[PDB]
């Protein structure tokens, strides 16, 4: 019967950028992950909670679908326990992440002919963010002893700089879309279940 709204996540027009990653709370629906895992479109389908094949057998309280664009070198940082500016200042998974990371080369549309600049990532933050935090804040960065009272100045960086995405870039400087399916069981009864 009714299939979960995966089309509105994986098949959308404009994804979030990694500092401001979108979340959709998939629940009260049947989740046909066989549509996903059989797709020739994906580069990466790393499942950490369970083996990818068994996803159509399981049921969960909710499946949070976290969506964002990152560089083709940075997709790796999305795995749990990874280190690096995406894993530490933008989108962090917990050590026991019970979910799947799915990613595809999206240079087809996320790249503009003279370069695209719409996607921002946080290069700087006073501390690593905690698992599944998101930090929208544009507050000027304190990169120097001098207090950044002025809007801009020495060591008063914008904690967010923009990607360089161009069609002729290498695999690595290309805009990989990522979605992270964080499956979750709680006291609440199970709703999102594979099809029969």
């Amino acid at each position: 019967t009714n299939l979960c709204p995966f089309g509105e996540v994986f098949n959308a027009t404009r994804f979030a950028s990694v500092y401001a990653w979108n979340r959709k709370r998939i629940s009260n629906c049947v989740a046909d992950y066989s549509v996903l895992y059989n797709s020739a479109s994906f580069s990466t389908f790393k499942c950490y909670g369970v083996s990818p094949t068994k996803l159509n057998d399981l049921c969960f309280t909710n499946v949070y679908a976290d969506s964002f664009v990152i560089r083709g070198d940075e997709v790796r940082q999305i795995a749990p326990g990874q280190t690096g500016k995406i894993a530490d200042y933008n989108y962090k998974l917990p050590d026991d992440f019970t979910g799947c990371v799915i990613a595809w080369n999206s240079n087809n549309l996320d790249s503009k002919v003279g370069g695209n600049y719409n996607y921002l990532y946080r290069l700087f933050r006073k501390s690593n963010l905690k698992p599944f935090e998101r930090d929208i804040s544009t507050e000027i960065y304190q990169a120097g002893s001098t207090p950044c009272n002025g809007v801009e100045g020495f060591n008063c960086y914008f904690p967010l700089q923009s990607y360089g995405f161009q069609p002729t870039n290498g695999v690595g400087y290309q805009p990989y879309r990522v979605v992270v399916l964080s499956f979750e069981l709680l006291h609440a009864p199970a709703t999102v279940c594979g099809p029969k």
Partner: antibody
Amino acid sequence: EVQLQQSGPELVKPGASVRISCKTSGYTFTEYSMFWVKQSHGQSLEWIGGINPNDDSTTYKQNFKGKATLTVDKSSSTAFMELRSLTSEDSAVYYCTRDRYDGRVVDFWGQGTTLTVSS
Amino acid sequence: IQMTQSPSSLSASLGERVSLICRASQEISGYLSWLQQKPDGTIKRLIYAASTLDSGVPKRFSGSRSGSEYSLTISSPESEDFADYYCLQYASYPWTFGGGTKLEIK
């Protein structure tokens, strides 16, 4: 061990330029900013300016901006100051320093390069 | 803009109390550091922030934001402590310093 190894005492006749290094160690070089100070024999110390090496960013005292030039090389992990038009104004003990926001501010310094422009 | 260190030179016996001041014309929001300079070239930080020190600072000498004035005060002199002292205004670029104050035996 933190050590701002720097260049030894130096002399050139006036109307010229000079090379001054400050090697740094005991930390990852791009995790801290670099600044500079000019202290004369008969005058107090003054801030020349600073080149955060990681972002290749540079700020100066307006007075020295027209005669200083700060640089780094990442592979050498070393700071480098160039001074031009060495006049009767251009002689002091010159000093390198490193900084950050989390408490490590203008703490450790280089030995003190006594640039002399006399003949 | 720079702040003014009250004295140029100050003299003492061993054991005498020593107060060193760097008064302010405009509020630097409590951003300031103290440095000591040996006449033979040794520079090292004493104090930063508001009465805060780190690394290895001689004994426990600390000052305070005395309203419009910034300060250093010490519970003893020492043979090495008899040298020149400076306040740095890292409150805003360009960084500025006080003229320095020299601490001496009688």
